[PDB]
Design a protein around this ligand. Structure first.
Ligand SMILES: CN(C)CCOc1ccc(-c2nc(-c3ccc4c(c3)CC/C4=N/O)c(-c3ccncc3)[nH]2)cc1
Length: 259
């Protein structure tokens, strides 16, 4: 069972902000990753959030998903996971811009694809896959994380247009989880964030959701296969329903992987 005996977790250093809470490096039967919520006495609205996330993490078990160890509430609402020695992808491609190699970038693509496949089969929708929620553990293995938004405003440049247009209270879908996977391709394939030459969020928001703006797909490393090119295109396709699902994505990647 999943509630960790209280006052069994040490926490050392602080690492950044998460989604409900803040993240820290800590101990619990080893190096672990802890995300907790400072706030002493917290909201009905907040511990909902936490009850929810937990409710979903408990359901995952799979190499490519960050591995839920436990959760506690006394003295604070804390989620614990394995520690990833390494960095988020984001932090690779755009902080220390790691010249990675093209087979490794397709591997990362495919490992993400694997994780998303797993997620969707279980009817989980991340709603916030982005290169920040992908931690690359011992550079070889991918773990999707941060299940604050998951289920059964977030980070903008991975939002599919229909999330953006905010057409009806709930416009999320495997299909949207796919549009974000496509921006992750766009980053992998181009060592870059989309829309670099625009500095006004609000504008991007508008422009993308309305269809006027979309990733310049011609910025993609030349070493890059063209099928992976066609794939990103099919992934990003503005019209919700045109986008392949993960099983088919997995397939496409795996296929062209024999090169
Ligand atoms: C914001 N500012 C501090 C600039 C510097 O930026 C940051 C750098 C790095 C990060 C960063 N978040 C996580 C993170 C995100 C979500 C969650 C966890 C860690 C643990 C449980 C969880 N649940 O959703 C990690 C990480 C995770 C696992 N292993 C190692 C690390 N790393 C966050 C911010």
């Amino acid at each position: 069972d999943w509630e960790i005996p209280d006052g069994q977790i040490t926490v050392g250093q602080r690492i950044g902000s998460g989604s409900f809470g803040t993240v820290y490096k800590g101990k619990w039967h080893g190096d672990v990753a802890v995300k907790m919520l400072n706030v002493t006495a917290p909201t009905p609205q907040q511990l909902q959030a936490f009850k929810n996330e937990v409710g979903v993490l408990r359901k995952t078990r799979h190499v490519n998903i960050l591995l839920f160890m436990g959760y506690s509430t006394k003295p604070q609402l804390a989620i614990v996971t394995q520690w990833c020695e390494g960095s988020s992808l984001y932090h690779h491609l755009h902080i220390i811009e790691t010249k990675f190699e093209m087979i490794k970038l397709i591997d990362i693509a495919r490992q993400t694809a694997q994780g998303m496949d797993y997620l969707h089969a279980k009817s989980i929708i991340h709603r916030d896959l982005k290169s920040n929620n992908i931690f690359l553990h011992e550079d070889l293995t991918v773990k999707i994380g941060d299940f604050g938004l998951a289920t059964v405003s977030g980070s903008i440049l991975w939002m599919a247009p229909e999330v953006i247009r905010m057409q009806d209270k709930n416009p999320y879908s495997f299909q949207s989880d796919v549009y974000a996977f496509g921006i992750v391709l766009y980053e992998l394939m181009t060592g870059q964030l989309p829309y670099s030459n625009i500095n006004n969020r609000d504008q991007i928001i508008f422009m993308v959701g309305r269809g006027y703006l979309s990733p310049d797909l011609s910025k993609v490393r030349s070493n890059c296969p063209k099928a992976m090119k066609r794939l990103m295109a099919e992934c990003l396709k503005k019209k919700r329903d045109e986008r392949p699902l993960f099983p088919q994505i997995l397939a496409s990647i795996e296929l062209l992987a024999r090169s």
